[PDB]
Amino acid sequence: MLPLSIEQRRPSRSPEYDQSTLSNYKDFAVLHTDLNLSVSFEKSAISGSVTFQLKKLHEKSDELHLDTSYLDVQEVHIDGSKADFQIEQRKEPLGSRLVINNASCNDNFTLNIQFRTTDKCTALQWLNSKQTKGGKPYVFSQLEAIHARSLFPCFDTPSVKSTFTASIESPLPVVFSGIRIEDTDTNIYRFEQKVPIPAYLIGIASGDLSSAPIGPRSTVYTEPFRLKDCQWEFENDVEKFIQTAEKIIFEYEWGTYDILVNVDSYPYGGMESPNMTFATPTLIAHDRSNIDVIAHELAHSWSGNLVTNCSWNHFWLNEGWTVYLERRIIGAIHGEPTRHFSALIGWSDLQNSIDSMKDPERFSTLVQNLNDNTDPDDAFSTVPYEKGFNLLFHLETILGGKAEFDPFIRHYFKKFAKKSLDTFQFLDTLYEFYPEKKEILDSVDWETWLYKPGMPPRPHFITALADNVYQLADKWVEMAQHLKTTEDFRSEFNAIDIKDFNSNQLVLFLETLTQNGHSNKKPKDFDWAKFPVASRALLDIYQDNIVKSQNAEVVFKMFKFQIFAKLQEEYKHLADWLGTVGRMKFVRPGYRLLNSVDRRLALATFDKFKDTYHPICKALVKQDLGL
Ligand SMILES: [Zn+2]
């Protein structure tokens, strides 16, 4: 009932089969999973057992195949009886297939595997005591996309979702992607995940953590020194966000919405493990300006967590729907011009991602096509997010806007609640929900959106907030050249200029500057180093909103404008600041900025702070400096 030749591409069975799994999930039903784990900070390993409640499905060849990757499976036990297993030879990138003899049991059986993580585990990130400001060891898992198979043996595919129950022992406190149960100290933390989740959403963190309320159904976890700060950051908006998102879709389904603010050495940008959102400390600005980042993880509570991409071929249904709903939450809070601006910055992110991404012709396509050979990680770029946002936004516009599309959002998420789906399954629900709207629904070029690489059709977004940034930014470039005095500059420019700018406008503003403005009529090879008064006059007049900002996002862009402006005095300040942040995205280009202008400082800086970043952060920064 939908357009050829999209139908031509329609898999034979939906949800589409997951090539990234070596497991045979199509043969089993996972009724419930249980993790009994023990954290050893000293061995850098998690050891224990996983217990599945499985039901045999009959609808040809039969066996029990599980995913593992560099994992020590010690014993298996079916219904309490030893069961015969063997581990195949490792196949990049999908790992070793754990084959277990299931012949003996009945339809519904209890599967218990005992295992140890390996030195080669790719599921757990370990930080020593030099790597956290608190001074205690820390560990967190990062499981997306197929790393769960490295934490425990399982059907490592987004199409298999199972309730969870978890007992984790640790010398240090433990948080989990679940709700903690009452216990009755043996250092054993116990949690329940009452909603079915995929294993990539399984999240564990253990370290020196305390907690504080940030809402009626929200608590924040983080290092104690940072505890009251983090609480202040989240406590004003977190419940409001949840309610904004509940109005756009429907009641939040997970009970509590908690946030773990990870250690400073945390190199990533966040994770949406259900019941415990992993957040970056660079979210803590002390003014609540870099806070809308929470709407995204929160949004995942519906799209991705509640309704899952069945495979990493259909990841856009995870992340695209989430950027959409995310921008809808902020749009509801800050006004339509803001979501359009969010959207417009997103369009910018997409093009740099497409211009640059390797094999921009295979991976830039909205619906991916990983067979059993492509690492699912190649499917993760800005495409799913932005081009997926743009397709959902396009669908919104043509259907008569938010009030016409909003009913489709509630049917979709209500229809696939607790299940997985593919692209094709989404479209049918789309076509099925608008009988009347069938004629323009059909006007959509699904083939270019879903299956062509490169930039999708460009949408018309309100450019208001971006115009102001570009205008103000262009003006500085033009004025850099006519005005020769700090007092001259102080009279054409005022703190009111960037007053009503939000965090994202400052970042674009400061970024537009280093691109010598944002206009066709841009001075060619205009350089900010040649105008020492203009550059310094900018950070001077805008000291309160730019220079005095503790928003790491705004702080980095400032350092960039200062490295571009070749303001030699500030380098020590960029050097010092690289000692305060561990986020790969600040630390890395941050060490690149410092090295170009002042090689000797970068090297000294890196020498003093090398062993304080996440080991991966250090390797990559050490690479750029040529060590
Ligand atoms: Zn996301």
Side-chain angles (χ1 to χ4, degrees), residues 272 296 300 319 385:
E272 72 281 1
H296 183 86
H300 265 302
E319 282 301 355
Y385 303 77

Coordinates of all heavy atoms in Angstrom, one line a residue, residues 272 296 300 319 385, ligand 1:
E272 N 21.8 7.3 27.0 CA 20.4 7.3 27.4 C 19.9 5.9 28.0 O 18.8 5.5 27.6 CB 19.5 7.6 26.2 CG 19.4 6.5 25.2 CD 20.6 6.4 24.2 OE1 21.6 7.2 24.4 OE2 20.6 5.6 23.3
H296 N 17.3 15.5 25.1 CA 17.6 14.5 24.1 C 17.6 13.1 24.7 O 16.9 12.2 24.2 CB 19.0 14.8 23.5 CG 19.3 13.8 22.4 ND1 19.0 13.9 21.1 CD2 20.0 12.6 22.5 CE1 19.4 12.9 20.4 NE2 20.1 12.1 21.3
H300 N 14.7 10.0 24.6 CA 15.0 8.6 24.3 C 14.1 7.6 25.1 O 13.9 6.5 24.7 CB 16.4 8.3 24.6 CG 17.3 8.4 23.4 ND1 17.1 7.7 22.2 CD2 18.4 9.1 23.2 CE1 18.0 8.0 21.3 NE2 18.8 8.8 21.9
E319 N 17.5 7.6 16.6 CA 18.1 8.9 16.8 C 17.4 10.1 16.1 O 17.4 11.2 16.6 CB 19.6 8.9 16.4 CG 20.4 8.2 17.4 CD 20.3 9.0 18.7 OE1 19.7 10.1 18.7 OE2 20.9 8.6 19.7
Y385 N 20.7 11.2 13.0 CA 20.1 12.3 13.8 C 19.5 13.4 12.9 O 18.3 13.7 13.1 CB 21.3 13.0 14.6 CG 22.0 12.0 15.5 CD1 22.9 11.1 14.9 CD2 21.8 12.0 16.8 CE1 23.6 10.2 15.8 CE2 22.5 11.1 17.7 CZ 23.4 10.3 17.1 OH 24.1 9.4 18.0
Ligands
ZN1 ZN 20.7 10.0 21.3

